[PDB]
Paper text:
Omega transaminases (ω-TAs) can mediate the chiral amination of several unnatural substrates without the requirement of an α-COOH group and are highly relevant in the production of several pharmaceutical intermediates of commercial interest. In this work, we successfully overexpressed and characterized the two recombinant transaminases TA_2799 and TA_5182 from P. putida KT2440 and solved their crystal structures. The overall structural fold of the TA_5182 and TA_2799 enzymes is similar to that observed for other class III fold type I TAs with two α/β domains. There are two highly flexible loops present in the structures of TA_2799 and TA_5182 that mediate the entry and exit of the cofactor and the substrate/byproduct into the active site of the enzyme, leading to significant conformational changes in the enzyme structure.
The crystal structure of L322F mutant of TA_2799 was solved at a resolution of 2.5 Å. The TA_2799_L322F mutant was crystallized in its apo form, with a sulfate ion bound in the phosphate-binding pocket of the enzyme. We expected PLP electron density in the crystal structure of the TA_2799_L322F mutant; however, only sulfate ion density could be seen. PLP may have been present at the active site, but not covalently bound as an internal aldimine, and thus, the sulfate ions from the crystallization mother liquor could compete and displace the PLP molecule out of the active site pocket. In the crystal structure of the TA_2799_L322F mutant enzyme, the ND1 of the N121 residue maintains hydrogen bonds with both OE1 and OE2 of E123, which provides further stability to the anion-pi stacking interaction between E123 and F322 in the same monomer. Apart from that, the OE1 of E123 forms a hydrogen bond with OG of S120, forming an extensive intersubunit network that stabilizes the dimer. The effect of the L322F mutation is observed in the thermal stability assay, as the mutant enzyme has an increased ∼6 °C melting temperature (Tmapp) over the wild-type TA_2799. The mutant enzyme’s affinity towards the cofactor PLP is clearly enhanced as observed by the yellow coloration of the enzyme solution post-purification and the characteristic peak for PLP at 420 nm seen in the absorbance spectra of the purified enzyme, similar to the report of Kwon et al.. The mutant enzyme efficiently converts (R)-PAC to (1R, 2S)-NE even without external cofactor addition to the reaction mixture. The TA_2799_L322F mutant showed the best increase in stability; it retained ∼70% of its activity even after 96h of storage.
Numbering used by the authors:
A (entry chain A): 4 to 459
B (entry chain B): 6 to 458
The structure:
Amino acid sequence: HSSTVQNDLAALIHPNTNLAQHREVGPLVIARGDGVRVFDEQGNAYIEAMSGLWSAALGFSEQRLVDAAVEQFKQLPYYHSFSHKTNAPAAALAAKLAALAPGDLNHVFFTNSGSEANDSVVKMVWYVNNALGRPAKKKFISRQQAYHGATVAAASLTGIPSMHRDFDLPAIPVHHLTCPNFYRFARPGESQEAFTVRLANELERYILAEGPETIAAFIGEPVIAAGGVIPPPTGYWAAIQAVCKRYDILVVIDEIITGFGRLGTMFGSQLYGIQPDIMVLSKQLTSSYQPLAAVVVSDAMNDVLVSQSQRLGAFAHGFTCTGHPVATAVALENIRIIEERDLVGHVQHLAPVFQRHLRAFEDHPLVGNVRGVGLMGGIELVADKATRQPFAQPGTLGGYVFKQAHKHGLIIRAIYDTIAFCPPLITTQDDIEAIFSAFERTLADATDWARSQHLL
Amino acid sequence: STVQNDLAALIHPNTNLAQHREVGPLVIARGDGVRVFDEQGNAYIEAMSGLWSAALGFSEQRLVDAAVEQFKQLPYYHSFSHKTNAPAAALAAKLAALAPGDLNHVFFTNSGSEANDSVVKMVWYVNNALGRPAKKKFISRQQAYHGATVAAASLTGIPSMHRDFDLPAIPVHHLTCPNFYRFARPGESQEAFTVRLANELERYILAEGPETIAAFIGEPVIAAGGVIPPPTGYWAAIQAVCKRYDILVVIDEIITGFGRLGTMFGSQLYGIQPDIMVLSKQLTSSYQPLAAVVVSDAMNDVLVSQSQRLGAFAHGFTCTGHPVATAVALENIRIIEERDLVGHVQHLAPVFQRHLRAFEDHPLVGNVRGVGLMGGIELVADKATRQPFAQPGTLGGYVFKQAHKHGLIIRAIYDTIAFCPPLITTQDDIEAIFSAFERTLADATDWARSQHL
């Protein structure tokens, strides 16, 4: 027990942690960062194959981000954006994001987190529809296994059952479509194109049952990340958009994870041909070196927001650190770096090698499914490959892989019994070989451990 | 280029977005102690510390140094799945020690809004765990401010924050605003007002059913709703009622925290023992986005017992416990303690309050109120009848704009002028503030005649 461990154990409530287990096993203290690696307090190295929380695009020791922070700290360490006040980095970053975003996504509202951002979206949509004299048009459509944040509103949009348990969620009008997961929900011999068609029919039937005039918006990640790295089936996004367009339902695309090159395009929306009305960004926006998120909205949306100020006085919504000069300065440098080094290009060239390494595990006895796009992938472990069936208590094996991978210098994320990989954009071919080498040893240990636990 | 960029692409918080297209932004470029400078080089005394937040002013190098030091070690890591970092852990322990009572467990967020949102979820979670599914309603107050997320803004009780947002969206009741000047009956004492306010709460609980009411939330002093200190005895009475019906007491110190009222926490000044305390703003002087929820041992025990059967506390933000933001909070608090800035406020408060009170007999001023280094000057149309103006906020709106021409940034809360200067404010700064305000108020007296009110 070091000073940090004693302090942690006394006083710190951990997010997304088994708080009871935590009292027994205690924390793992991370002390230092170096490229795609982080080091614990004892000096052990770990390849961070998840970029932290899908977030650390430029790795854990990019000096240029520190420099951008330092530069801005010396000018103006803090000011707000209320009552017409602004600062240069926020304004520049707004314009940058307006330019990068497809279509007429040209207006930016800043928050600290993805959660706050999605919460802001819910409020904006309600506000807009009230302004347009459509009081009934307020319901959001999401999907099972979606993740959209942790505030009451955002977590309501979230569709992972464990994130709702005992939190009285959803607490706002939300309907969750089935998870677009071909491996799990496709019928025998059904094509992806046919699955897409059923998924789109599911959406349309729901709209018609509820009444289109009651449905304001659809929200979705291009690829479902925290829900188990589930890429969409072929044609999914074109079908979903066509239905939304037919019934005047806003399309809200959550690129909190997919944004800034993760899928081999700057935004996942480009890869899947999505034209959002609203796009939400965070994480790789700053490599999480600073808390920042952005809501980008259409000119149409913005026009309604503005027309509301005409009759209501002010847009009565904001956070203290909305537009923080340091956080936005860091985002600007982060984006400069991604463009200048063509890291989107790098991902396109690295993706096939990353995916090939993933696919290598298809024929493993424990592996039921492998899936991935760009530089994000998942390996789902199952009890029986024939019946694609999960384990007695899902997450037992994944939980073990998560712990055991540490002993081989690897940090991954277990989503129940799916192992997730989302390495930094600066990952090299050599880093990939190191990751999967370490994972192969972990999976060997797991194969042993699973037999002695009589799980298979 | 900043203005063109702003006008093209930036949706401003808490701004008239239509007016913004016409007048455009004011670009703030540089900071120096209690001053900020625009792009054109004009100086302004920031008598609001930004948003009640910049405790150590706008150019404290030690905070930058703490940030830089931490950036070079570990610029980012998360606190999920048992992971931790040294600053987060140290800050948790520090806050656990500073907080009164058995407030010993800390959960970190980026904002006050997220923090209060977390509180709502924690309370619901705990009551579900303890087999009380109906016990979920929050009690707040008119003019309260608790944040801008759907849930937090629902707790907020400023009507303009709800307009056209379909809020509240969760079970909440708003008590009358504890504002003696405004809502006392003729010749009523503060002690009597408090008694009615406490009775109001109790009778509401009994009418709704105590088994449906989970928690009370309140700022010790209502800040954003118009710098409204509680009436005498208020907090003792409110606590007694809450205790009687097993209603959690949640104290929002997002603004009052870290010396603002002349004690480290406002809870100490007013003898409040919270079950839950919420902190932000002055926690980092807003140099980094950070907030903290501090909870009792009892609360925490239930959170822990839930992990035993659910497998996880299924709540978190990416930047929960951010090593840089927490590092900065630690240094910020170290600085407040080392310089005894709580002590500084105690010695400066009487001078600050005296300067405020000087305006009591001004023709435009109906009421002056304040505690510690927070104050408000409420402008009215008639001092006799304590009556507001035709459209509230017209005069205050003018004072806000006009003060800029005299190098002063304040905040207009409708027609109440708010003052919340940095903890590092000096006696000289105070004289400069009120000097500039006196000129502003003179301009306002002229402007009010020509507008016929």
